[PDB]
Amino acid sequence: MDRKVAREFRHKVDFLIENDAEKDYLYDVLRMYHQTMDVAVLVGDLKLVINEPSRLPLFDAIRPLIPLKHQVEYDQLTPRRSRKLKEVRLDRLHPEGLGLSVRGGLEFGCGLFISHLIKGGQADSVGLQVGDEIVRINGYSISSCTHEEVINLIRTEKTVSIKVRHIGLIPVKSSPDEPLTWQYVDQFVSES
Amino acid sequence: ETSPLETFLASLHMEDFAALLRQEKIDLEALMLCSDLDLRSISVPLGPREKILGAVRRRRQAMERPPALEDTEL
């Protein structure tokens, strides 16, 4: 079985990672994990290559490689994702607002992400999360929208419906000349 | 599921102009290149014409000179 598992895993690695040095690092940290069985260190080391949304399926690809006794902890330490979309209905005329912050848009080359949550607020109460990507506002696709257009679209009606996909990463660009990078929720929240 | 033009016009409270624009074979890519005269010629009134044109300009400036990523509090 281990030549079949290796074959299927290798196909997933080649598809999601272009660079050979990044592949070599990936296989090396997995080799180290097999020796030490330190799952926390593994997930921490994996983050160096799993550094953008398109690379997150690697966590799914790696999970079968993880022995049964560590799969619960592995799931806890990795972002919880699902291809099923979550829909919520929010009231803009609420005295305390929506209770969330939002960053991103087409001009940044990234989607729209919830970056802050007010604990006990309206967004929080409906189960929205820091790291959620907004994929739909009032029924509309926002893949071709700038930041301002999305904000204006949210403010069109007295109420707003948001469809959400949990990613667990936040886009970062501290100046107009900086490249777009990604931070895991825990880092972004701690540094804010 | 919705077109770039449909969402663009929806953010401007101008959904009702989507029928006219699609009829004149104008998608968002084409609209970005529309002058005041172009929209005048297809019977777009002054108020709506200036709203569209302003939004095109803001879109172009954001795409060409994107700032730092910042959070909008809602």
Curated annotation (Swiss-Prot), chain A:
Any idea where the PDZ domain is?
87-169
Q: Where in the cell is it found?
A: Cytoplasm, Cytosol; Cytoplasm, Cytoskeleton; Cell projection, Microvillus
N-terminal domain: where is this region?
1-86
Expressed, tissue-wise, as follows: Expressed in small intestine, colon, kidney, eye and weakly in pancreas. Expressed also in vestibule of the inner ear.
Q: What is known of its domains?
A: The PDZ 1 domain mediates interaction with ANKS4B, DOCK4, USHBP1, USH1G, SLC4A7. The N-terminal region constitutes an independently folded domain that has structural similarity with the CCM2 C-terminus, despite very low sequence similarity.
What is the annotated quaternary arrangement, including any partners?
Answer: Part of the IMAC/intermicrovillar adhesion complex/intermicrovillar tip-link complex composed of ANKS4B, MYO7B, USH1C, CDHR2 and CDHR5. Part of a complex composed of USH1C, USH1G and MYO7A. Interacts with F-actin. Interacts with USH2A. Interacts with SLC4A7. Interacts (via PDZ1 domain) with the C-terminus of USHBP1. Interacts (via N-terminus and PDZ 2 domain) with CDH23. Interacts with USH1G. Interacts with MYO7B. Interacts with CDHR2 and CDHR5; may mediate their interaction with MYO7B at the microvilli tip. Interacts (via PDZ 1 domain) with ANKS4B. Interacts (via PDZ 1 domain) with DOCK4.
- Please tell me the disease that this Swiss-Prot or TrEMBL record associates with the protein: Usher syndrome 1C: USH is a genetically heterogeneous condition characterized by the association of retinitis pigmentosa with sensorineural deafness. Age at onset and differences in auditory and vestibular function distinguish Usher syndrome type 1 (USH1), Usher syndrome type 2 (USH2) and Usher syndrome type 3 (USH3). USH1 is characterized by profound congenital sensorineural deafness, absent vestibular function and prepubertal onset of progressive retinitis pigmentosa leading to blindness.
- What the protein does? Anchoring/scaffolding protein that is a part of the functional network formed by USH1C, USH1G, CDH23 and MYO7A that mediates mechanotransduction in cochlear hair cells. Required for normal development and maintenance of cochlear hair cell bundles. As part of the intermicrovillar adhesion complex/IMAC plays a role in brush border differentiation, controlling microvilli organization and length. Probably plays a central regulatory role in the assembly of the complex, recruiting CDHR2, CDHR5 and MYO7B to the microvilli tips.
- From the Swiss-Prot or TrEMBL record, give the protein name: Harmonin
The organism of origin for this protein: Homo sapiens
Q: Which gene encodes it?
A: USH1C
Q: Which residues of the full protein are shown?
A: 1 to 192 of 552
UniProtKB/Swiss-Prot annotation, chain B:
Tissue specificity comment: Expressed in vestibule of the inner ear, eye and small intestine.
Q: Which residues carry this modification: Phosphoserine?
A: 35
Where in the cell is the protein located? Cytoplasm, Cytosol; Cytoplasm, Cytoskeleton; Cell membrane; Cell projection, Cilium
Looking at the record, the residues that make up the SAM domain are 1-60
Associated condition reads: Usher syndrome 1G: USH is a genetically heterogeneous condition characterized by the association of retinitis pigmentosa with sensorineural deafness. Age at onset and differences in auditory and vestibular function distinguish Usher syndrome type 1 (USH1), Usher syndrome type 2 (USH2) and Usher syndrome type 3 (USH3). USH1 is characterized by profound congenital sensorineural deafness, absent vestibular function and prepubertal onset of progressive retinitis pigmentosa leading to blindness. The first cases with non-syndromic sensorineural hearing loss based on mutations in USH1G. The hearing loss has an onset during early childhood, is progressive, and has a downsloping audiogram configuration. Ophthalmic and vestibular abnormalities are absent.
Q: What does this protein's UniProt record list under function?
A: Plays a role in pre-mRNA splicing by regulating the release and transfer of U4/U6.U5 tri-small nuclear ribonucleoprotein (tri-snRNP) complexes from their assembly site in Cajal bodies to nuclear speckles, thereby contributing to the assembly of the pre-catalytic spliceosome on target pre-mRNAs. May also participate in recycling of snRNPs back to Cajal bodies during splicing. Plays a role in regulating MAGI2-mediated endocytosis.
The UniProt subunit note reads as follows: Part of a complex composed of USH1C, USH1G and MYO7A. Interacts with USH1C (via the first PDZ domain). Interacts with PDZD7. Interacts with CDH23 and PCDH15; these interactions may recruit USH1G to the plasma membrane. Interacts with intraflagellar transport proteins IFT20, IFT52 and IFT57. Interacts with splicing factors SF3B1, PRPF6, PRPF31 and SON. Interacts with the U4/U6.U5 tri-small nuclear ribonucleoprotein (tri-snRNP) complex in the presence of pre-mRNAs.
What is the protein named? pre-mRNA splicing regulator USH1G
Biological source species = Homo sapiens (Human)
Q: Which residues of the full protein are shown?
A: 388 to 461 of 461
